[PDB]
Amino acid sequence: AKQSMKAREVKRVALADKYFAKRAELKAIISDVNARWNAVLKLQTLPRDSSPSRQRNRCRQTGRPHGFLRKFGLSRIKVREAAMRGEIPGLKKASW
Amino acid sequence: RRRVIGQRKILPDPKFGSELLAKFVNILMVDGKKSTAESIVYSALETLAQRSGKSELEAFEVALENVRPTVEVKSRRVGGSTYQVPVEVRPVRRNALAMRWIVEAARKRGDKSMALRLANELSDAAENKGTAVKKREDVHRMAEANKAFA
Amino acid sequence: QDGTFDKLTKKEALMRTRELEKLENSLGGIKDMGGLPDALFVIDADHEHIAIKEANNLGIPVFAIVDTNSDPDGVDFVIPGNDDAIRAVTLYLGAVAATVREGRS
Amino acid sequence: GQKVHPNGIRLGIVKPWNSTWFANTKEFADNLDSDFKVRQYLTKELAKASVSRIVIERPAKSIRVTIHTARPGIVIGKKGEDVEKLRKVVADIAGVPAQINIAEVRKPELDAKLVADSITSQLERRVMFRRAMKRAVQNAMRLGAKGIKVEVSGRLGGAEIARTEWYREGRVPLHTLRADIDYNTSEAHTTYGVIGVKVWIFKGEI
RNA sequence: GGCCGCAAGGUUAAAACUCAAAUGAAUUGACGGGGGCCCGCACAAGCGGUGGAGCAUGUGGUUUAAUUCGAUGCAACGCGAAGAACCUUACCUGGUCUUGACAUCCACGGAAGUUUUCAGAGAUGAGAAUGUGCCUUCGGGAACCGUGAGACAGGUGCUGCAUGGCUGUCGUCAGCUCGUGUUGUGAAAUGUUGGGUUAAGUCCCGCAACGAGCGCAACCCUUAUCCUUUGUUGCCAGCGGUCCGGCCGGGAACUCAAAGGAGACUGCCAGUGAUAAACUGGAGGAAGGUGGGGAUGACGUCAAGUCAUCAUGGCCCUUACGACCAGGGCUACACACGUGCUACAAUGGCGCAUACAAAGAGAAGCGACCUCGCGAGAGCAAGCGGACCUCAUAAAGUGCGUCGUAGUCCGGAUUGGAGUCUGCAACUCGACUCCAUGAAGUCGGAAUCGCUAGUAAUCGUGGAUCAGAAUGCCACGGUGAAUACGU
RNA sequence: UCGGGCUCAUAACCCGA
RNA sequence: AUGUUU
């Protein structure tokens, strides 16, 4: 969580919606056997604080960078806590 | 504890017909591979044939008679001291005790295949010898030597 | 009795019907009552002493037969007799019917 | 935790959800946020509005909602004024032009959160928690209720040690599935701490 | 001190100083190496394990610039962490900032932006051109960009003895209480004790008790049956067709799917038993005596755990305990412990061929097909958003070649050289493949754990988290035991 | 003496060197 | 045997 951190992460997100949003391949094709130079691969200093592998999740509701659920977005605490009330359609406590 | 049960029997001999015999196949069976147990408890008698001759059916029980005990002891604590009071075991567990001790030594033969490591002890009983038959009378030692109890 | 036990299979009845079974037997003479006594008259005074415990409190008239071992304290209306006497068991008991209905009208 | 959430294991029977629609790994994600976002801003303002629940649906590229307020009047204001203003909040915090509406809640003194948020405020209002919860809260009983109760938290009053008060009437067997009980909470930030509330309102079994 | 005595000592009998009590009876609970009674894999009866070995993972210690923090008998130690190369990330060394990285707001300039240049590790700083949005009763304003200034903002900073919320714990234990009445000066008691009985404060009987609330028993799930309907992607029986492939038509019969039901209730039979409850056998049935497995965890105790999810009382930091970037560390090691994985082998290993499940997964996804590659995989590219396709080629098992009890035809650690890929990026610190090397180890002391049946045991399969690193967790089925006198 | 076990934990006790 | 620790 920590607003100061949350925001610090938000940056790591927008950057993808820019550089990686398209220019990510603008050099990719020139990276794999598609002859083929190295200049682009060499002057490759565009994606720094930006990387499609440096973005964390953090409980959507809160912001815990652990115990995340793709199908949702929150962490065990919120999810369970919320599901209890019913902010999630069809999510009754499982018990085969 | 406060409840009582009966017994858990199962499918008897695949053809020779023998409920208890199954135990020899189960007790010996390991990793829940009964499919292989029948491959050892059956093939065993198929080898003792020339060995003994007469129906392998009797062959088993025959020597088996010289392996089954008939009196054991159970630790019972009293006033600090825990006596080893003796007790004559009924047939039910009797025959069982044998099979356990029987299959055990057989797997301690330390030779090659179990098929043979099993027959050896299956006949070693009658002729007398081996670890299996050992326990038989070995138990008798502790027995009576404590008759001063029960 | 009324069309209410008709619910639940032929078995449930026994459950609620058994409940009443005891109730009636214990709460025999009271069904009509709905307030308090006025002058209770017990039979085996001594033995049924605990049944007078409540009487001595309020002050409701208490009459009852007291043998030789009875407790002539709780009962404020002395009248010995015999908690037994299979035949004399109703004797003094009958002299009550008169006092009641056949004595008030 | 000895007792679990009496409302959690109830979404199946005798108790409805709060956000019935549809969504997959794709939408469910953004959807989980939406239902949240709204209920956040909506409540803050609909506070004095006496809310009981906030249902949320979604037919297509738009949310439905159903502000369960004990007095939607305040939510209206100058007749449409208030409502309209907020009707835009959702359309922007939902990403799509969503509908709107309400359904006043009568007998508010017999509703979980409503009664909960009720006894939680009296605190800051300078009242005696005990003399309050055992009175200006149990009122539900008066309404021919079958059973109800409330279990406060710690730091009650000027105490420096957390605790918990009893006081309860009727029967609240939070074990019977059919039973059905209304549960909710409210962290009434106390001038010197943060006490909690737990209202158990059981209205008939199945 | 006096008196008595052979003596040992007796008899008479103080004070200083010190404490706020000492003490009697009785009540509640607790405990006992007190008694009676009764349960739970507690033991007993069995099977298989741990400590042995190597490795994985956590921890203590130790070390370090840091080895971020919390978790500690059971009830911490593959725990928070369902996923630490960067990121994460809190810790460190250094570079750098000071109404801020994130908020609102006031004022000024400029639509926002665009792509690039140089220098830097980057954080940035200074530029070069370009872009010229919404309205305006023309100032002004809406967003927004930079700056100025503050009110403020920021803190995974400390108190889990200030707290919420959440959870562990005995304990799935059968208990825990309350109102009224009554007994006692009272503290309390009764109920709730007792006789049977039950898995059960379960039920009946009795009784100064009468009733009731929370809890056990039910309704929820799911499985075991049978029916109804629906029959596509699922099904294939009688019919033919057939490239002989449920492949065609076709048929709705079957499994199956999945919504609604049927059913089990001491319900009925006998005995026992107070002709009470209940128990023990029986029938019928797929199913018997809460059918099996889930979920559900009473009043409470351990000031039990978590201010680090988040929230929050107080307290504290305020060119900083705030903030941004690059590298390092959490992946140290001279040791110790916990939970695990793999073997030590012929109920086995390796080569051949072969026999069959269940449940889930998926558009920045699962990715067939065919080509090349010893190989990881790379290329090509269809199909399926899915009872339509891809994951999917179950493993044990079975029948043969064999090897012969060798540290080996076992076992695989370790290491060297060469490669693949996921990624800016894999030295520090990644998963896999290729060849070469082949470890310790031959069944493990004191001690210690799990498991009563589809269980234990073994063998595989899928999911979650997730760019890319599961001996972990969650879940699925295949096969498939022993043993239980008794406390 | 040390390393491990036993106990809630010590000593003692048991194991190993 | 003890635990403010045989």
Ligand SMILES: [Mg+2]
């Ligand atoms: Mg914060």
Ligand SMILES: [Mg+2]
């Ligand atoms: Mg990541």
Ligand SMILES: [Mg+2]
């Ligand atoms: Mg005393």
Ligand SMILES: [Mg+2]
């Ligand atoms: Mg059990």
Ligand SMILES: [Mg+2]
């Ligand atoms: Mg044992």
Ligand SMILES: [Mg+2]
């Ligand atoms: Mg052993």
Ligand SMILES: [Mg+2]
């Ligand atoms: Mg790091």
Ligand SMILES: [Mg+2]
């Ligand atoms: Mg502040």
Ligand SMILES: [Mg+2]
């Ligand atoms: Mg605590």
Ligand SMILES: [Mg+2]
């Ligand atoms: Mg702590």
Ligand SMILES: [Mg+2]
């Ligand atoms: Mg403490």
Ligand SMILES: [Mg+2]
């Ligand atoms: Mg009861």
Ligand SMILES: [Mg+2]
């Ligand atoms: Mg239950």
Ligand SMILES: [Mg+2]
């Ligand atoms: Mg704080």
Ligand SMILES: [Mg+2]
């Ligand atoms: Mg770590």
Ligand SMILES: [Mg+2]
């Ligand atoms: Mg996957």
